[PDB]
């Protein structure tokens, strides 16, 4: 049972967190899908966060720094050819990922195949994995917050720590 | 064990400028010029090792090894003549109540193992076989 | 491969057989010298041509001479 | 008791001249006596290899400490001589009054054999050789003013030299420290990082704030050197200082209180270069050293000694281990506390690396008054420190290899970083080989492509700023960042750290001191060539360190040693397979690398920076901007650089620059001479010697020390030595002669 | 945790199992490449490889060649690519002759004379055709603008 | 019975699998760290030990190191691809440096090096002076 075996993701501040019990009757396969989705959504969020921060900061040294510092405006300014490459490239990696998933012994979320060398018995391994998840969870919320600020509040920079 | 397996190679000594096949042969009987890697589910170097899902690193899969038991045999076979010479001399020096060369060998090697037997002087052997 | 020859000027110092990096030389019984031993080259198929043996000989002119010749994988020291 | 204590043995070695009369005493083998000429050479080659002279680390350590005192004594005598020669054989006084016109000179030749021609009419009613070490500028910055002061610093130097020499004798013959004393890294670092560097900086800041700054302000204003008050006067009369810097009036009260702002008069962050002298503002330099001093002193309190608080380096090193690196940095502490060679490796590499950095930072940000306009001194210093650096870096690699062959112990290094490195050496070397080939083919190919195209009448197909262009975009970007920094990322600064990044043209005396240096296609091409040269050097040197103990070819290389000629003619040939030989080959590549770098500096500067500017804005560079379209082809370097800029040396005869011409020729000769040692072998020479000896014997006489030919290894060494001397010597003269004229 | 282990658990083979050498990503990519994929016939293996290599080769010649600025530059680029393909094909032919010999038996083993010949043929067709496809594509480049 | 080693990129290659291979064996009384010719450090086992190498010299080099540990029971073998094994060293059970009765002389010339024939004399013969 996923609930009886899962070790990564359960941390100190709240322990197992399922207030709405969205995983009570789910089978191992569904739960595996959830974990994979969680990690992917989180990892993409972390990356997006870094991208937004750099652009907002003004460090966008491409196209002669022609594009706007506002991340959301810049996307509109980007030629479609750029976007197409992005989607297609990510799609390619997705295909390869599917191949890895099919291979026996797949651990949800592992694309490097670290299972070959390390298992969850190692506490260091589980801990580092937890850090990825925790930071990813935070990043997900952050990217959603930042977009709100840029689209509604009207700012695309830090309004929290900016005041030294 | 074919003690001549190595000697039976394709090497042909030249007239002048070559030491020869020496004692254990100059070259491997097999030819190193084999092919490269092959697609999954295929073999290339004759009795090669299947690379499984990683044919690219098939050459790193060992198939040639040494059996410890077999190792003992090769030691005995290649050193048979030496043992013969040793026991023969022991026999020549009027062994005490001698029996048969082979019998003596077994008795002398029962004790002092075999390696020790090969490295012992006839005098030491006679002292050992005084009994 | 290479050719190693021993001459009558040998004194059975055993230094050559103790220097070979590939066990090509041996000490065999002999009566021409006080030591009662002479060197032999039973396994020249493993000579790499180092000439360390020659460097160890104490005789006026080397009693052990290595003449380089045909080259094989063993003589060319190829691990690949 | 205490972890850190002083242990010294009294009267360890008797002082006598007996051993002096017994050459070769240090070695067991050499001590027996000379039988062939090889003994003589070996005596000199094994003189300072203490590890082979004794088997006790304590003894080796003791010798090193004392030997170092000896070097310090020599250095002090050297500095002393320079100051003396600047007091009795120089035109400093005249130069001080008119720095722009009079030329620096501190060496005079005796009037023997027409050599007097070498005494040039430098200026100030003085005739001598124009020196290029930059002593005058340094002395002015210190505030010397007089030549009496130079004499006294010379006397101090002599005294210091003697003290050091005594110290060497004392700490080897009368009070020799024991090994336990030497093995106290934490204490040594605490003392050296807080006392040697921290207190040193603070002391210097004191001199700069109380003596140099005030005097230099007066000098720049126009006050005659004779009218400037003596140094002691400034130290005593605070009122005088208050006039110049109106904050000394407040005294040290602001300092003890937190109001450090009041001292903004002399401690500043102006940036840029002083318009009058063309050098960094001394006020900034004073704040620099003061700030550095605080940092160093604080850092000196990081390691444990005898009071509990602090860090133990062993613990820090062992804790830093990861998933991909096994046991991590375990075992390194013992190595660096039980092997002098290992320590020298790291220290020597870093020292050389620093010299190279000094060269770059000292031209972009001229540190001394009236140095930038003196093109000769600028070029001399850059090249000098570039070279010192290269040699030291290669030396570090050499001693690193000596460690692997002599001190490495498999037992103490299991699954540590070192072990794991030696376990994938094939991968490292293989990849580096490829990187070198990639860079070399692409980088040099650009030049060959361009040459072919220009020769075939197809200039539109060249990799040039006027055709296919390869712009250094990344570097151009960083330059802009640094240019706009003042007032933004560096709010309290007032100007760019260097005008090279951008800004205006600073001119002193009608000559350009600094100007924005731009980067284009040619710069891209040359920079990548520098990468290729450095990378290849690393390949040879690293291969030597990694494959020092063993290889697939010679599995027992370790037993053979660090410096063996070969293993034999077998295995297809094993010539030059020792680690020493790798260093031998590495030096040749280091020569190439540095040569290209110094040439880049010389042509770029004389073409895009140095020159004269009119009262109005008209900049005339020395060579005329030829670097952009001429340095993109090899023919360009041969014609627009070597052939054209060598017109000075070749036409120096009959002038005070005649010496450079003679040396230019002499160096070429020595370079060629070396090629006979590098291409030939001992066999031919030994046989020739036999015939020569026959002649001497035929006349009933011959040396008992039988004449023998130089060893294989020595042959290579002699060749490399002459090769390096000749090559560097040639450029030395070329540069100096050209520079004298351009200045 | 150790991410580097002896390959195939043989401590004495000259290879190591690093993340780069043996990761799910590397294994997956290499397994499905035309060269090592399972089921592909010698001809098809060559075809896929050729189709891939021909498409990217027309670029360098077309945009940086002697007649790049000429109106017939793309045509010239195509011809140049075909020439390079011919040189490479000669190499493949010669390699096969030396490595495999003159008469074969196993069959369906990329490492035999017959299979190699089929592989070579596929490469030529695929490469030349792929280059042609690029010519057609580069003739008119889409701006993907609405 | 393999000694404890973590692997290296300096091990054997294809030749070991298609042409020829070597193997050394020895017995130890304690677990100690030794340096392997391939590069790196390994820990021998308390008892029998077996290691594979690509060259005879590499094997004999290790034997030298073993002698330092006071181990003199080493044996070297050559394993061909088909599985055939040849015992190579100590060949007759007695180390070569020690005269063992029963060994015959080979490649011996009964005269000083200076008594070899002149090259011209053996011209168009195919033999060399040192083999003449
Ligand atoms: C001008 C003289 C010269 C030249 C060209 C070289 C060239 C080289 N040396 Mg070398 N060397 C020299 C003098 C020279 N050496 C001397 C005097 C010494 C004595 C100290 C050494 C000692 C030495 C050592 C010890 C090492 C080298 C290494 C190298 C190689 C660096 C890798 C590289 O860039 O490949 C590129 C080579 C080129 C020549 C670039 C130009 C070639 C064109 C422009 C590129 C495209 C050509 C293309 C491949 C084929 C065209 C086809 C058609 C022409 C037929 C390279 C082969 C290192 C090495 O092998 O590591 C890789 C190394 O370790 N050298
Ligand atoms: C992609 C979204 C996503 C997904 C699929 C999961 C999935 C999972 N989380 Mg999780 N988590 C997320 C985001 C996500 N998380 C975020 C952003 C946080 C930070 C608050 C957390 C914090 C968190 C903790 C602290 C723990 C988990 C745990 C778990 C696992 C068991 C709980 C469970 O079944 O949840 C089922 C969840 C889903 C099926 C999907 C989530 C439901 C969606 C998102 C509805 C949207 C609701 C939300 C309000 C949308 C608005 C967001 C924003 C606009 C305000 C499960 C694999 C537990 C665990 O690891 O145990 C093994 C655990 O202890 N999560
Ligand atoms: C296969 C190699 C390859 C090549 C030749 C290119 C070439 C190019 N990419 Mg590209 N790209 C690649 C792989 C590659 N990419 C991959 C693997 C990804 C990630 C999936 C991207 C993601 C990417 C983005 C996101 C963008 C480009 C853009 C561009 C173009 C630069 C701007 C321009 O049109 O100037 C002539 C250029 C045509 C930019 C572009 O077309 O915008 C104008 C752009 O925005 N690329
Ligand atoms: C992890 C915490 C965190 C994160 C994610 C950000 C993220 C951001 N900060 Mg911020 N900041 C932080 C901590 C953080 N800050 C702290 C602790 C301070 C106090 C030193 C500041 C002070 C600060 C200033 C003064 C500015 C930013 C700005 C920015 C934005 C530009 C990105 C950049 O290059 O910054 C740089 C970006 C959204 C810039 C911004 O809002 O641009 C519009 C900006 O001007 N930050
Ligand atoms: C780095 C140190 C250094 C160097 C390179 C020079 C170099 C020079 N100095 Mg100088 N000098 C120095 C330090 C130095 N000095 C110091 C520290 C002082 C203060 C004492 C002086 C004081 C000084 C004066 C006062 C004069 C020079 C002069 C000169 C020039 C002529 C040198 C000379 O006498 O030639 C000729 C050399 C000799 C006469 C010495 C004889 C050669 C001896 C006998 C050989 C050595 C014997 C050997 C070591 C035996 C070994 C025994 C064993 C116990 C070791 C020359 C350019 C002269 C000059 O420029 O005049 C215009 C001059 O007048 N110097
Ligand atoms: C006049 C005083 C004096 C006397 C009589 C001795 C006597 C002795 N010392 Mg000693 N020593 C002295 C001063 C003295 N020392 C000083 C001042 C130092 C500190 C630098 C040392 C450092 C020292 C060390 C480190 C060692 C000795 C050793 C020895 C013994 C062997 C002599 C030897 O190696 O010949 C040396 C004779 C020479 C002529 C060498 C001189 C080389 C010069 C200084 C090079 C520089 C010249 C020039 C500037 C550079 C080129 C231009 C001997 C008992 C050695 C010994 O046996 O220890 C057990 C030893 O290892 N001494
Ligand atoms: C901090 C500097 C430093 C120190 C303390 C040492 C110390 C040592 N090195 Mg080392 N080394 C260094 C820098 C240093 N090195 C650098 C920078 C390099 C790179 C070039 C080397 C390269 C190197 C090699 C390759 C070797 C050493 C060796 C040694 C050891 C014995 C030295 C010896 O034989 O003495 C005797 C010293 C000499 C014979 C030098 C005399 C000077 C010669 C003749 C050149 C003079 C050139 C001169 C300036 C030109 C004048 C021109 C004029 C005539 C016109 C010793 C531990 C050797 C060893 O066995 O280590 C264990 C060894 O093989 N080192
Ligand atoms: C194609 C069929 C019709 C072609 C036609 O009608 O010509 C008519 C056109 C003539 O197009 C010409 O183009 C030139 C350059 O721009 C000129 O400027 C003119 O545009 C024009 O006259 O031919 C083509 O250019 C298109 C043909 C492209 C062929 C596709 C590649 C197929 C593979 C080629 C490699 C063969 C080698 C082995 C194959 C396996
Ligand atoms: C470079 C990226 C980097 O720093 O990775 C560092 C990587 C991981 O290091 P670890 O954190 O596992 O080990 C920590 C200790 O080495 C102390 O830092 O080490 C390697 O394996 C380098 C591989 C060769 C380098 C490839 C070129
Ligand atoms: C040039 C030269 C030289 C040099 C000289 C000099 C360098 C002089 C000077 C000297 C000096 C002039 C020194 C000084 C010093 C000082 C100092 C070093 C200071 C210190 C300080 C302190 C110690 C403080 C302390 C404290 C504090 C911290 C605060 C509180 C109080 C107290 C007191 C506690 C010589 C001749 C050698 C040689 C040649 C060259
Ligand atoms: C960086 C990277 C990557 C990669 C990339 C690449 C490398 C790409 C390539 C690509 C390519 C390189 C592609 C190719 C393509 C090709 C094609 C598309 C072709 C086609 C052809 C056709 C279609 C046909 C032809 C023909 C024939 C066959 C013959 C007859 C005629 C014709 C014409 C019909 C990715 C993103 C993954 C990810 C990340 C990393």
Task: Offer a quick outline of the entry.
Chain B is built from five helices and no strands. Chain B has 131 residues and is mainly α. With 146 residues, chain E is mainly alpha-helical.
Largest sheet of chain C: 2 strands, antiparallel
Widest sheet: strand ordering of chain D: 1-4
Structural class call of chain C reads mainly beta
Largest interface here, residues on each chain? B-F, 39 and 40 residues
What is the chain-wise order of helices and strands of chain C? EEEHE
Intertermini distance of chain D: 65 Å
Number of helices of chain D: 29
The helical percent of chain D reads 55-70%
Tell me the total number of β-strands of chain D: 8
Overall spatial form of chain D: globular
Provide the gyration radius of chain D in Å.
29 Å
Oligomer: part of a larger assembly
Kindly report how far apart the N and C termini of chain C lie.
18 Å
Query: What fraction of residues of chain C sit in β-strands?
Result: 15-25%
- Rough shape of chain C? elongated
Question: What is the count of β-strands of chain C?
Answer: 4
Work out the radius of gyration of chain C: 13 Å
Protein name (chain F): Photosystem I reaction center subunit II
Membrane topology (chain F): Peripheral membrane protein
Subcellular location (chain F): Plastid, Chloroplast thylakoid membrane
Keywords (chain F): Chloroplast, Photosynthesis, Photosystem I, Plastid, Thylakoid
Question: In words, what does this structure look like?
Answer:
This is part of a larger assembly, with chains A (164 residues), B (131 residues), C (80 residues), D (743 residues), E (146 residues) and F (132 residues). Chain A has 164 residues and is mostly helical. Chain A is built from five helices and no strands. The longest helix of chain A has 31 residues. Chain A is globular, with a radius of gyration of 19 Å. Chain F is an alpha+beta fold. Chain F has two helices and seven strands, in the order H-E-E-E-E-H-E-E-E. Classes of the chains: A mainly alpha (164), B mainly alpha (131), C mainly beta (80), D mainly alpha (743), E mainly alpha (146), F alpha+beta (132). The complex binds chlorophyll A (CLA) (7 copies), 1,2-distearoyl-monogalactosyl-diglyceride, 1,2-dipalmitoyl-phosphatidyl-glycerole and beta-carotene (BCR) (2 copies). Chain D: It catalyses: reduced [plastocyanin] + hnu + oxidized [2Fe-2S]-[ferredoxin] = oxidized [plastocyanin] + reduced [2Fe-2S]-[ferredoxin]. Chain D: This is Photosystem I P700 chlorophyll a apoprotein A1.
């Amino acid at each position: 049972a996923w609930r009886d075996e899962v070790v990564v993701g359960i941390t100190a501040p709240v322990g197992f967190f399922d207030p709405l019990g969205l995983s009570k009757g789910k089978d191992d396969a569904t739960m595996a899908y959830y974990r994979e989705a969680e990690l992917k959504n989180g990892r993409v969020a972390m990356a997006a966060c870094l991208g937004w921060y750099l652009n907002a900061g003004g460090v966008h040294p491409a196209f002669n720094s022609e594009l706007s510092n506002d991340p959301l405006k810049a996307m509109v300014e980007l030629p479609a050819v750029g976007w197409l490459q992005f989607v297609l490239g990510c799609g390619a990696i997705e295909w390869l990922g599917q191949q890895i998933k099919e291979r026996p012994g797949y651990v949800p979320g592992d694309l490097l195949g670290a299972s070959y060398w390390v298992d969850n018995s190692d506490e260091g391994w589980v801990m580092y994995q937890n850090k990825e998840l925790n930071n990813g969870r935070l990043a997900m919320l952050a990217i959603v917050g930042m977009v709100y600020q840029d689209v509604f509040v009207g700012d695309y920079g830090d309004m929290m720590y900016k005041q030294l | 064990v074919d003690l001549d397996y190595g000697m039976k190679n394709s090497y042909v000594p030249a007239t002048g400028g070559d030491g020869g096949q020496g004692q254990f042969g100059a070259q491997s009987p097999n030819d190193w010029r084999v092919a490269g890697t092959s697609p999954v589910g295929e073999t290339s170097y004759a009795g090669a090792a299947d690379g499984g899902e990683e044919p690219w690193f098939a050459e790193a899969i060992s198939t040639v090894s040494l059996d410890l038991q077999k190792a003992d045999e090769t030691l005995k076979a290649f050193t048979k003549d030496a043992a013969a010479f040793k026991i023969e001399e022991f026999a020549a020096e009027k062994p005490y109540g001698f029996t048969s060369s082979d019998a003596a060998m077994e008795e002398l090697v029962g004790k002092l193992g075999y390696s020790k037997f090969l490295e012992m002087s006839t005098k030491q052997l006679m002292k050992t076989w005084g009994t | 491969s290479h050719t190693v020859k021993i001459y009558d000027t040998c004194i059975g110092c055993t230094q050559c057989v103790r220097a070979c990096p590939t066990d090509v030389l041996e000490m065999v019984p002999w009566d021409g010298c006080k030591s009662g031993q002479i060197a032999s080259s039973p396994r020249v198929e493993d000579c790499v041509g180092c000439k360390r043996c020659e460097t160890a000989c104490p005789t006026d002119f080397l009693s052990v001479r290595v003449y380089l010749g045909a080259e094989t994988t063993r003589s060319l020291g190829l691990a690949y | 008791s205490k972890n850190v204590q002083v242990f010294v043995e009294k009267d360890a070695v008797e002082t006598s001249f007996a051993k002096w009369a017994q050459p070769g005493h240090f070695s067991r083998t050499l001590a027996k006596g000379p039988k062939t000429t090889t003994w003589i050479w070996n005596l000199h080659a094994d003189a300072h290899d203490f590890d082979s002279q004794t088997s006790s680390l304590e003894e080796v350590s003791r010798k090193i400490f004392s030997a170092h005192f000896g070097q310090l004594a020599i250095i002090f005598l050297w500095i002393s001589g320079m100051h003396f020669h600047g007091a009795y054989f120089s035109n400093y006084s005249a130069w001080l009054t008119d720095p722009i016109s009079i030329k620096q000179s501190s060496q005079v030749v005796w009037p023997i054999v027409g050599q007097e021609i070498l005494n040039a009419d430098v200026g100030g009613n003085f005739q001598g050789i124009q020196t290029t070490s930059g002593w005058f500028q340094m002395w002015r910055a210190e505030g010397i003013t007089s030549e009496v002061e130079l004499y006294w610093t010379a006397i101090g130097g002599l005294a210091m030299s003697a003290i050091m020499l005594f110290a060497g004798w004392f700490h080897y013959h009368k009070a020799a420290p024991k090994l336990e004393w030497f093995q106290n890294a934490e204490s040594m670092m605490n003392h050296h990082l807080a006392g040697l560097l921290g207190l040193g900086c603070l002391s210097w800041s004191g001199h700069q704030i109380h003596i140099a700054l005030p005097i230099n302000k007066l000098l720049d204003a126009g006050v005659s050197p004779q009218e400037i008050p003596l140094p002691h006067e400034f130290l005593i009369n605070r009122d005088l200082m208050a006039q110049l810097y109106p904050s000394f009036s407040k005294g040290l009260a602001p300092f003890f209180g937190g109001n450090w702002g009041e001292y903004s008069d002399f401690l500043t962050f102006k940036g840029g270069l002083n318009p009058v002298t063309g050098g960094l503002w001394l006020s900034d330099i004073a704040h620099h050293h003061l700030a550095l001093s605080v940092l160093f002193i604080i850092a000196g309190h990081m390691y444990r000694t005898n009071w509990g608080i602090g860090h133990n380096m062993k613990e820090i090193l062992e804790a830093h281990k990861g998933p991909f690196t096994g046991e991590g940095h375990k075992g390194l502490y013992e190595i660096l506390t039980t092997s002098w060679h290992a320590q020298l490796a790291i220290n020597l590499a870093m020292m050389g690396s620093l010299s190279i950095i000094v060269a770059h930072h000292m031209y972009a940000m001229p540190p001394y008054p009236y140095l930038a306009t003196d093109y000769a001194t600028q070029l001399s210093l850059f090249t000098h420190h570039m070279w010192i650096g290269g040699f030291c870096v290669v030396g570090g690699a050499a001693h690193g290899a000596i460690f692997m062959v002599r001190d490495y112990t498999p037992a103490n290094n299991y699954n540590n970083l070192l072990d794991r490195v030696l376990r994938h050496r094939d991968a490292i070397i293989s990849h580096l080989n490829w990187v070198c080939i990639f860079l070399g083919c692409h980088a040099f190919g650009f030049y060959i492509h361009n040459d072919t195209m220009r020769a075939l009448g197809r200039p539109q197909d060249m990799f040039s700023d006027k055709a296919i262009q390869l712009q250094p975009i990344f570097a151009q970007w960083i330059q802009n960042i640094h240019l706009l920094a003042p007032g933004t990322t560096a709010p309290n600064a007032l100007a760019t750290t260097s005008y090279a990044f951008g800004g205006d043209v600073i001119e002193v005396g009608g000559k350009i001191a600094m100007m924005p240096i731009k980067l284009g296609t040619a710069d891209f091409m040359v920079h990548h060539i520098h990468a290729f040269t450095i990378h290849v050097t690393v390949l040879i040197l690293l291969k030597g360190v990694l494959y020092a103990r063993s290889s697939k070819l010679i599995p027992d290389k370790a037993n053979l040693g660090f410096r063996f000629p070969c293993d034999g003619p077998g295995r297809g040939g094993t010539c030059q397979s020792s680690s020493w030989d790798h260093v031998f080959l590495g030096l040749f590549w280091m020569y190439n690398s540095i040569s290209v770098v110094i040439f880049h500096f010389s042509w770029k500067m004389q073409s895009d920076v140095w020159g004269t500017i009119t009262p109005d804005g008209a900049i005339s560079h020395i060579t005329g901007g030829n670097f952009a379209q001429s340095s993109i082809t090899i023919n360009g370097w041969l014609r627009d650089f070597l052939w054209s800029q060598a017109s000075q040396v070749i036409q120096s005869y009959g002038s005070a620059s005649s010496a450079y011409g003679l040396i230019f020729l002499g160096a070429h000769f020595i370079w060629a001479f070396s090629l006979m040692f590098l291409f030939s072998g001992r066999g031919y020479w030994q046989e020739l010697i036999e015939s020569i000896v026959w002649a001497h014997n035929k006349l009933n006489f011959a040396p008992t020390i039988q004449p023998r030919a130089l060893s294989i290894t020595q042959g290579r060494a002699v060749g490399l030595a002459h090769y390096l001397l000749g090559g560097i010597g040639t450029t030395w003269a070329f540069f100096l002669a050209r520079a004298i004229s351009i200045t | 945790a150790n991410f580097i282990k002896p390959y195939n658990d043989d401590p004495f083979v000259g290879h190591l199992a690093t993340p780069i050498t043996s990761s799910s990503l590397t294994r997956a990519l290499l397994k499905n490449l035309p060269a090592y994929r399972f089921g592909l016939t010698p001809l098809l293996r060559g075809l896929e490889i050729g189709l891939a290599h021909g498409y990217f080769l027309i670029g360098p010649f077309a945009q940086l060649g002697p007649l790049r600025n000429s109106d017939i530059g793309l045509l010239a680029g195509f011809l140049s690519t075909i020439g390079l393909i011919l040189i490479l094909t000669l190499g493949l032919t010669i390699y096969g002759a030396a490595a495999f010999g003159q008469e074969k038996s196993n069959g369906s083993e990329l490492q035999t004379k017959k299979s190699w010949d089929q592989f070579k043929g596929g490469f030529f067709v695929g490469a030349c055709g792929s280059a042609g496809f690029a010519f057609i594509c580069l003739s008119s480049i889409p701006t993907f603008a609405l | 019975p393999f000694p404890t080693f973590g692997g290296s990129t300096g091990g054997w290659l294809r030749a070991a699998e298609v042409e020829e291979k070597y193997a050394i064996t020895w017995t130890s009384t304690k677990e100690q760290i030794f340096e392997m010719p391939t590069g790196g450090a390994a820990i021998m086992r308390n008892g029998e030990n077996l290691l594979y190498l690509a060259r005879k010299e590499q094997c004999l080099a290790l034997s030298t190191q073993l002698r330092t540990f006071k181990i003199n029971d080493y044996k070297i073998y050559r394993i061909f691809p088909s599985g055939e094994v040849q015992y190579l060293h100590p060949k007759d059970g007695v180390f070569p440096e020690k005269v063992n009765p029963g060994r015959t002389s080979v490649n011996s010339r009964g005269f000083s090096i200076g008594k070899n024939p002149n090259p011209a004399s053996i011209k168009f013969s195919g033999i060399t002076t040192y083999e003449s």
